[PDB]
Amino acid sequence: HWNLIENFLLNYSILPPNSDVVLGDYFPTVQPWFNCLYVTMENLKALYWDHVVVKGKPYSITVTAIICICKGDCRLNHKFPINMLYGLQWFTDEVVAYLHGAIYRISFENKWFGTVTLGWWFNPVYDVTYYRVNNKNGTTIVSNC
Numbered sequence: 001h002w003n004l005i006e007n008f009l010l011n012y013s014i015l016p017p018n019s020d021v022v023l024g025d026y027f028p029t030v031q032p033w034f035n036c037l038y039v040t041m042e043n044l045k046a047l048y049w050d051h052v053v054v055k056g057k058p059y060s061i062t063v064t065a066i067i068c069i070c071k072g073d074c075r076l077n078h079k080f081p082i083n084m085l086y087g088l089q090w091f092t093d094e095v096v097a098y099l100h101g102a103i104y105r106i107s108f109e110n111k112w113f114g115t116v117t118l119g120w121w122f123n124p125v126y127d128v129t130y131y132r133v134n135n136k137n138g139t140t141i142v143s144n145c
């Protein structure tokens with residue numbers, strides 16, 4: 001089901017009219033995939049899927065559909081209806097969420113821990129994957145580089 005990865009990447013990229021660039025990020029992968037007293041995985045940088053808790057300090061982020069960022073005061077609270085791939089991506093100074101066809105971005109410094117617990121296929125991301133995108137001929141094309 002490569003088209004799921006391709007659609008994600010096409011939505012991520014939209015670039016200027018004449019772009020040919022390699023994008024290196026914690027993109028959804030195809031090698032590991034998991035489908036299961038809860039599951040714990042460590043050292044994740046991002047997590048994608050077709051109740052998820054990512055611990056951090058002072059802030060943490062969870063998805064139960066409702067997604068929230070709160071201490072332990074709240075910074076984010078969004079509710080939404082459900083070939084879209086969803087997921088969370090986090091960095092020292094920001095949180096990026098991919099939900100229901102929209103990309104959201106929140107800014108705040110937080111110490112993240114590589115600990116994620118969940119209670120439905122999951123796609124954990126441990127490292128950076130590179131993709132090349134080229135839209136120079138008017139159509140955006142995605143390939144490996």
Ligand SMILES: *[C@@H]1O[C@H](CO)[C@@H](O[C@@H]2O[C@H](CO)[C@@H](O)[C@H](O)[C@H]2NC(C)=O)[C@H](O)[C@H]1NC(C)=O
Nearest residue numbers: 001002003005006029030031141142143144145
């Ligand atoms: C980039 O590399 C991945 C493998 O890491 C390619 O994935 C293949 O996709 C086809 C369908 O298009 C599947 O039938 C293969 O089984 C997949 N390979 C593996 C190892 O799972 C991907 O197609 C490559 N990108 C492009 C544009 O070709």
Ligand SMILES: *[C@@H]1O[C@H](CO)[C@@H](O)[C@H](O)[C@H]1NC(C)=O
Nearest residue numbers: 007011012014083101102103
């Ligand atoms: C995501 O891709 C879908 C097509 O699968 C498209 O309809 C939707 O508008 C895209 N979202 C963004 C933010 O580009």
Ligand SMILES: *[C@@H]1O[C@H](CO)[C@@H](O)[C@H](O)[C@H]1NC(C)=O
Nearest residue numbers: 134135136137138139140141
């Ligand atoms: C752009 O390149 C793709 C891939 O080769 C091709 O399918 C598409 O038709 C091309 N666009 C134009 C306007 O030729």
